[PDB]
Design a protein around this ligand. Structure first.
Ligand SMILES: N#CCOc1ccccc1C(=O)NCc1cnsc1
Ligand SMILES: N#CCOc1ccccc1C(=O)NCc1cnsc1
Lengths: 304, 304
């Protein structure tokens, strides 16, 4: 019993964190096999950040200009390339701590763990979610660029995110491990406002099932609704539209608790229309949306 | 920018997790040097849990009865002892992944990271706090016993907690690494109700400073208070009394933000007397108390 914002064990990802220096800029890199992956803005100076031409800037850089340090030992750069907004630094040594891995581009609503690093060293681990506006509400300071988001399936690490920047509103933007940004963000110091931060409806439902399982049942009501009715209510409150796909994904939670998905929707509907009235659900005074139906099933079953 | 419930990187602790089996019971163990530490209720059967005499139960167990498995390889038990509520299994091999470590008994209000394990394998990491009633609001299922709480200071892991049980109210009880329970809990299936779960006042103040630093300032008011006045308000709301020691601990946060500790207390006082009025602080609708003044300083400065 008990429900917590749980991150994956970070050991496998710690073994990949390196420090990348180019000129005076120092950020983090991800070392998998003989390749070190890092944000391309490592090649920029504070004067370049406003409007950089990365192709032009990269002409001035050679293999010896990128200083890669794994722990306290220097890695030899035998090649470099730019793929979208990341740099791939071919080193002469394969990372001996390289776990089994995949590079996946996740959808908004999916959650992942972030290993926050500074100067190639891990400082903390926390759980995140790709917001519907393609931002992440991380906790990142200057020098955190290069830190990665990830999911683990027993022994395989699926890298999904790499941190690149903080928007003027304090939220975060980054790429997948192919260098493609999530959303419309560009790696330059320009006007980039985020879109509507809507609530992940399927994740709030999953978190309501996690509360029923753990004993919090005060919010269960005598009502039901239809998908269309609930969606009219969800539109008003800036909640993502719930689809039949989301209902099917909530299937094993509905099955375990014996509460039909549309019944839980009518509970969510009343909570939106009436508030919590000073009460709490899983020790939280607001409707949590950063646990997927999969995270609930994993945490509640004990998947290792 | 951004403030998250951040856990320490778990790699160093993952390298210590082993599986301990005694008869039909299987729980987790912590392998440091040539010693495997685990809860003593590993020697109990479901029939013993009601009223066990661990000294008597232990007479029937020999070195070969405790099956220690580090990863997929078996560890040889060359000795066993009981220290309070833990068992120390002397193995023939020192753990080659033993980090620098200390065993510390923490006070209530202190926070730590938990590495939740099942069958010796880590499944998740989250941040906890020793509640003022000596319980922890963890996320633990059957077989999670043996999972440990910890803090890291650069390279040294301070082990502070080992999970032992779940009280009938769904909260958790456990020991320090010497086997001494936090609070009055006993490792038996008996009536054990928790005391008042008061709010950690110094941690709410620290979290209010973390919000000011990160841009959330709506709650800052034109008022101030005295320690005695604030404490009368804190008594009413089941908040821990604030001491001059807590004021001094909040010194660097007060210094960085330029907001006197007693001014932040009057902000906390108004928030307690008037509620949040549907607003949020650091994306939370309730006053967070599981970040110490040290955690705020660490997260906001980027200590690796
Ligand atoms: N605002 C802002 C940028 O500062 C940061 C704050 C938090 C996390 C990362 C950075 C960071 O180091 N970005 C560097 C950068 C990215 N694209 S052009 C320069
Ligand atoms: N209620 C209850 C116990 O079940 C648990 C739930 C969550 C975490 C641990 C346990 C657990 O395995 N305790 C075993 C135990 C501890 N002392 S006598 C038997």
């Amino acid at each position: 019993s008990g429900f917590r914002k749980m991150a994956f064990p970070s050991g496998k990802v710690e073994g990949c964190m390196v420090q990348v220096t180019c000129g005076t800029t120092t950020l983090n890199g991800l070392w998998l096999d003989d390749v070190v992956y890092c944000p391309r803005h490592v090649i920029c100076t504070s004067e370049d950040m406003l409007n950089p031409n990365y192709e032009d800037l990269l002409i001035r850089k050679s293999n010896h200009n990128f200083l890669v340090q794994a722990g306290n030992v220097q890695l030899r750069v035998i090649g470099h390339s730019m793929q979208n907004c990341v740099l791939k630094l071919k080193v002469d040594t394969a990372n001996p701590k390289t776990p089994k891995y995949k590079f996946v581009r996740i959808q908004p609503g999916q959650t992942f763990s972030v290993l926050a690093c500074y100067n190639g060293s891990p400082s903390g681990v926390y759980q995140c979610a790709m917001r519907p506006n393609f931002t992440i509400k991380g906790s990142f300071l200057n020098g955190s660029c290069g830190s990665v988001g990830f999911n683990i399936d027993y022994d395989c690490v699926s890298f999904c995110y790499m941190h690149h920047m903080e928007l003027p509103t304090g939220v975060h933007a980054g790429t997948d491990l192919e260098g493609n940004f999530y959303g419309p963000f560009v790696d330059r110091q320009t006007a980039q406002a985020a879109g509507t931060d809507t609530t992940i409806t399927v994740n709030v439902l999953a978190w309501l099932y996690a509360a029923v399982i753990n004993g919090d049942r005060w919010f269960l009501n005598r009502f039901t609704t239809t998908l269309n009715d609930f969606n009219l209510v969800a539109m008003k409150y800036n909640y993502e539209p719930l689809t039949q796909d989301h209902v099917d994904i909530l299937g094993p939670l509905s099955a375990q608790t014996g509460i039909a998905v549309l019944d839980m929707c009518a509970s969510l509907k009343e909570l939106l229309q009436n508030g919590m009235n000073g009460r709490t659900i899983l020790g939280s005074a607001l409707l949590e949306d950063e646990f997927t139906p999969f995270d609930v099933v994993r945490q509640c079953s004990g998947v290792t």
